[model samples]
Target chain A: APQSITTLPLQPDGENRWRLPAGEYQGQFTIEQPMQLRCEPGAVIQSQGQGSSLLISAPDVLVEGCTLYEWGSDLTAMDSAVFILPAAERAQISNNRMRGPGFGVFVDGTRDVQVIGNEIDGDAGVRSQDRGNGIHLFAVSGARVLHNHVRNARDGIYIDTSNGNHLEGNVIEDVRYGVHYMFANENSLIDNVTRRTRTGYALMQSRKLTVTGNRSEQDQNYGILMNYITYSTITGNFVSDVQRGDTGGDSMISGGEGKALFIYNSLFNTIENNHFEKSSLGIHLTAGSEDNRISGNAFVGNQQQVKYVASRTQEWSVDGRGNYWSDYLGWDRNNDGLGDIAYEPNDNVDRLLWLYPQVRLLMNSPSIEVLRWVQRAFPVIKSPGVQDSHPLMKLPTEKLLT
Target chain B: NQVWNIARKELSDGLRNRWLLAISLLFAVLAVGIAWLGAAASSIPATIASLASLATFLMPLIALLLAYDAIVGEDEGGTLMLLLTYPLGRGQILLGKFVGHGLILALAVLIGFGCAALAIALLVEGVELGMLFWAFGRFMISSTLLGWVFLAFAYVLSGKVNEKSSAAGLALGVWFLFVLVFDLVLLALLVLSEGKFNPELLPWLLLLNPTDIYRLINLSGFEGSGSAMGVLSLGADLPVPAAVLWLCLLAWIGVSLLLAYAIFRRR
Candidate 1:
């Protein structure tokens, strides 16, 4: 039912695109010239689980609507379904279905690669720690990864040492992380959806990222975790129900409270106007995450609102605009939209609870009550904590449509 | 008419003695003091349950001392002889004293807790007026009820030992037993029972002490901005609803006063 050719043309196609008919195209295949190739809906490329399925070496190549399966399992060799080589600039890998133990689309040291609307399904039987990412962009520049769906990979999208990348509208699931960034800067992560992952977005060692309009639902560890990030603008995202799940790391970190936003050692970032609710811990800031403009957010129905252990006072509002806390008790008098009093979310009681959880049993007990009364009546001891001086009375429902 | 007349006479006597003025100032200072310290912490202990601890410790002491000489000292000074010619039965006259002292204690608690709560609300910019009154109002009721229970005990003690000095000493002993010693004794039995002390009977044991019941009302009633734990951590633990604990407190007042009445009728 098909034609088998040992060596296909390594040239450009005509107005009628070169069509590969249905049958098996096995082993390693490399294209050395620019071409537009479309499979007739039935061509399947197989590598028999040994090495890369296809290789592109020239620029402006298009591999459309082809099914590629069972590529190499070796991550050291950097096996991939379509490995766009270093010189293959402005290559478009679009509308392909790939199933493999290795990477789906690996743009290696390339620039201006457009990876769009590909379905990548990795081997579920392979250990997650051993499997490659569904989409890998390494040392890449000006790449756009858009509208792809990736499942069962080590990471849905892995960008390493890459810059000026634009990732948008991708749906990622069942991966260790939806998007993993390392030493990557100036990337735009917008409107992506991540579900059922250990962490939705693992943002580390990067700066000047524009992360907005993203949504993460029910992530296991964290929705958007930033480690050592600075000068980033993270706004207009909706993250809900990030549970108190295992972080699965062996280091002596606090067992993941599955924070909606975990900001560690980050500074000068604008974290504004996000909606984080029904989460285990709403927002956790540690290691001097100070001097950041954090305002105009909504924290609704979290088990714990914030866990900032730093003894210095940090204010969450500026210039009379503050985050909306659903549990804020002060009312709006004088017909103003702001609360009449400041909102302080923690005290010594919470500090005591975290240090010795067994003390919670005696939380409302007499001695504890006396301690509270003593603290209330004495002002002799003082501890610094988070306070919102101008807490919001309400957030408009229409503005949340974004 | 007789109950009213006897009640008025006692109320007048307490006012003239400045007992209400003294106790009210003490409570007001206590509340404001807690509040003043509360301000420095930022998350001031505005929780109404703050009164629960202080009241459990102090309300019983004041009531016991105040009424320790209620009947025995009157009888010792021959004041009971003058009152004996009144157109009232022994039980009715006892009812008058109870009503009068109960009002006096209630007013003292209200003015004390109320003034502090109101002042804190007025002076402190952020303290909610509604919360202050609700928290203060609830605790005052429970605290006054606690005072009444202790006063009933004093009456029982005063009536039991007709000597003035003996009644005073007995009243102090009762205060030590109920206010201070009950928990350690109960805790000892609980520990001796190896932490497996009857889980079902545990809450009932708390009900047996008026102070514990008072603690329960505040500890559980105005549930705080913190997670429930420790004594209240019984989970399926403190199974007794607060209404039942309230009933037990009222019953302590009832049962003790009735015992005092029985002794008074016979003597």
Candidate 2:
């Protein structure tokens, strides 16, 4: 413990790798030369309550094993714990602990920078609207964000207008959204775990994205939300217990039940091999989002299974392989692991609940159930909706997510 | 004070005669039996659903049987004239009889659903006992109110008919018409009109029947069954709110009682 803080004019040590001693330090540093600066276990960098602490200005800079705290809360000014500039290509900011009111690691226009294994807590008691992202990637390409734990931020990892970046093995909790993509394309998100979030994986206005191996537990509103996303593949995601928020007013489409997957106006996507369990609603596809291929998923114990607000039918089975529905009743006479009868999820009775939205009251009436049974017995009245020609008789083998 | 004594007398009479015991035991057996035997989903919700489902059918019948003989039977036994010899008005007498029957009904629901809740607390693992209690309390209140609605209907029949046998026969008909026949007709109307049967007015039509209102209120509030039945995922524009439905049920009670009291008053 030192009484006075030291300001060391940072230069690489005798071995060409600068190592800070275990002590208290102050002021902002802009590294312009390629170098590695390793901090000893007790090294602490305080921002004097204003501005970023470390700004990297050169390529191949490495900052690790330090604690950065009390950074500025200026969102418009882009205050961050480690703000990597455009010139700092291939920078590695890993294995550090950062507590801040602003962005934890802001990667700006850098290529192939690695931000890994950092524990970031926006950790703020302040309002989530005013808080910054745990990891903000702006126009950065070919970056890797792996094995980071971020919580209590507006969003865990936010990528904006970036391309071909990769995010994996991140644990996010108690945030607005776990991983959000805005106008970012061709990114890969895998092996991420998010709990207690408003939305777990929010891919909006993005395309050619690969999102797989993610788990959302106890998330509210939506587990995987895709709005205006095209040409994406989402598979092998396990989402459970995604509860609903408050009910909505007299709108055509209300602030709705918590859906495990909500695909809105997205096209040409594939959703497969996912497990959606015990949510308020399972999969809600609306607003002309009928071009997606959905199969090989297991919808177990969800309140309502498929809510596709479309006039035309979308086939959920491809090549005789279909998803497993817990509510489906069938006989596999041939023992080929598929149901002999076709599975129709919504008759006019179910769609009437969607179209009128008021018949929800009569939904529990035994006569209404009789009407449902009658409609199934006589298909004289038919509407266009989801149809699984080959329903799976058994659930697919479930894989655990990390 | 007179109404209180009338309620106490009805309760005490039923208790002394063991009818209250029979009713309470019936509900308890249904609750416990449904939880243990009727395809248990291992929840207070599914238990509530199972119990409410069968209870929805059985409750109206029981309510009708208890109420249809209230006035006409007493009148035939020559006790109505003796009661009228007192200072009580016809309205007060009708109100007293209705409240007395309602209290008996409420007590039965409490004991029955309470036993179910206690069994759930013991049998179900990882139960949210607070939510379980809340759900059971609401269920009991709804069940009692449902019984009161049919009770009022039976009273209306009692005042309309002169013979006790006719009132009892008409009570069963009323139950059949409301509990089983109303929705089938509505569904038929829907199919005939090809769902073009003015969907806006359907919910209000349901409110016209007390049993449908009870079913709506009971199904909308619970988990598992609500979701499974497509009643919980309503978008935004629900024409009926729970408060409105409850008010409608209360209005059913008020109007039916008033009608019966009107008929009971001699010119």
Error of 1 at A5 (Å): 9.1
Clashing pairs in 2: none
Docking class of 2: incorrect
Q: After superposition, how far is residue B247 of candidate 2 from its true place, in Å?
A: 61
The list of candidate 2 runs beyond 4 A from truth reads: A1-15, A246-255, B1-267
Worst 10 residues of 1 chain A by lDDT: A1-10
Question: What stretches of model 1 exceed 4 Å from their correct place?
Answer: A1-17, A247-255, A360-382, A395-402, B1-267
Q: DockQ of each candidate's interface versus the true one?
A: 0.04, 0.01
- Report the lDDT tens digits of candidate 1 across residue range B1-267: 889888998788777666546665776687666565555455433334455656766677668756787788789889887888877798887888888878878877777677667667666787777866776777888899999999899889988897988987898899889865776676456435533556466656776788777867776644432222123223225676868888888999999999989998876
Supply the global lDDT for candidate 2: 0.76
For candidate 1, the per-residue lDDT at A329 reads 56
TM-score of 1: 0.62
Query: Which numbered prediction scores highest in TM-score against the true structure?
Result: 1
Tens digit of per-residue lDDT, candidate 1, span A149-245:
9988887798898999988898998887888888788878898988888888888888888988888878886878888787899888888799877
